[PDB]
């Protein structure tokens, strides 16, 4: 995955946001993103711009016209993908079209880079021919300023994660905090998500680098944590005492 050399463009994936945080903040993490599979083809948006006139009467050299840049559009992103009406992601796409809201969607390239736009569905088509798989054709009109791949030009790549949990007794009506160490050379551009095992013995609450386990029921509870796209993970064990 070298982003300073040309790449062949095979394996480019497409995702649509379904979370609540800032979509431009951490687009490398595929946590709150739904993948649209079987992409037949994809034409990205065309960042254009309009021109204002910049020729004045008092100006010398009136022989040559002059202009200037104005408001830049984000273009339309079109793509056709295999039609699977019974698969989640196409249902979400049709709900996105019907509701009419402006959501974020990212394109991941075979480069380690991601281009995330914001827009709304402006077209939903379908091609039905024999001897060829039925395809669904979608067009998304973009609004605002997008987050290009040239913005995320630092990427520390992390490659490190660990957990130091309390792993101690938890009493009823009280909760413990589990330590997470995520400093592989300090600079980091990755995230994580922690969950419970049975959701009955103890429950997890994670918000902003902090993990809190509350002992709903006694026994031994297991907590798995997965970071970012899923490259790294960890497991913790917590004991809850009835008394």
């Amino acid at each position: 995955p070298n982003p300073t050399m040309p790449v062949k463009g095979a394996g480019t994936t497409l995702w649509v946001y379904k979370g609540s945080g800032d979509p431009y903040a951490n687009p490398l993490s595929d946590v709150d993103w739904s993948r649209l599979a079987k992409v037949k083809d994809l034409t990205p948006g065309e960042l254009t711009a309009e021109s204002y006139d910049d020729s004045y009467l008092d100006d010398e050299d009136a022989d040559w016209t002059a202009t200037g840049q104005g408001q830049k559009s984000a273009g339309d992103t079109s793509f056709t993908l295999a039609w699977m009406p019974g698969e989640q992601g196409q249902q979400a796409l049709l709900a996105w079209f019907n509701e009419g809201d402006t959501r974020a969607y990212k394109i991941r390239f075979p480069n380690g880079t991601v281009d995330v736009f914001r827009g709304w569905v402006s077209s939903i088509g379908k091609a039905v021919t024999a001897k060829e798989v039925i395809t669904r054709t979608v067009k998304v009109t973009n609004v605002g300023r997008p987050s290009m791949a040239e913005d995320r030009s630092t990427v520390t790549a992390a490659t490190g994660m660990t957990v130091t949990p309390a792993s101690t007794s938890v009493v009823k009506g009280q909760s413990t905090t589990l330590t997470v160490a995520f400093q592989p050379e300090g600079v980091t551009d990755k995230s994580f998500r922690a969950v419970s095992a049975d959701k009955t013995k103890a429950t997890v609450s994670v918000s902003g680098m902090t993990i809190t386990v509350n002992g709903v029921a006694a026994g031994k509870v297991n907590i798995p944590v997965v970071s970012g796209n899923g490259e790294f993970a960890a497991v913790a064990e917590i004991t809850v005492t009835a008394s």
Binding site: Y52, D53, Y56, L57, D58, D59, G70, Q71
Partner: protein
């Protein structure tokens, strides 16, 4: 403040309309006189286009004189500095720019 520094883009309208005393006699004859003593003053239909930040400065300049008062301006028509007054200066706001339309009337004063 004395001098107008902004520049006019599109191609203005420079209307002269001299004032004359005219008497029309009978079978085709007439009698004409220049009425006044000092030429005609001429008026310019000027339009500016400015960024949304300099529009406040242009408005302050045109409001300080406030209809009365005169400022110096060298029109891109004869390149002779003249004293002018502005009294309307309508302005249309846009996303990134502001378009001013105004009528500059030359004054001896």
């Amino acid at each position: 403040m004395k001098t107008f520094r902004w520049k006019v883009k599109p191609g203005m309208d420079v209307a002269s309309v001299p004032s004359v005393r005219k008497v029309r006699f009978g079978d085709g004859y007439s009698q004409r006189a220049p009425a006044g003593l000092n030429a005609n003053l001429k008026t310019y239909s000027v339009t500016l286009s400015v960024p949304r930040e300099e529009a406040t400065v242009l408005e302050s300049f045109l409001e300080e004189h406030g209809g009365w008062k005169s400022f110096l301006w060298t029109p891109p028509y004869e390149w002779r500095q003249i004293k002018v007054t502005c009294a309307k200066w309508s302005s249309r706001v846009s996303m990134l720019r502001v378009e001013f339309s105004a009528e500059f009337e030359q004054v001896v004063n």
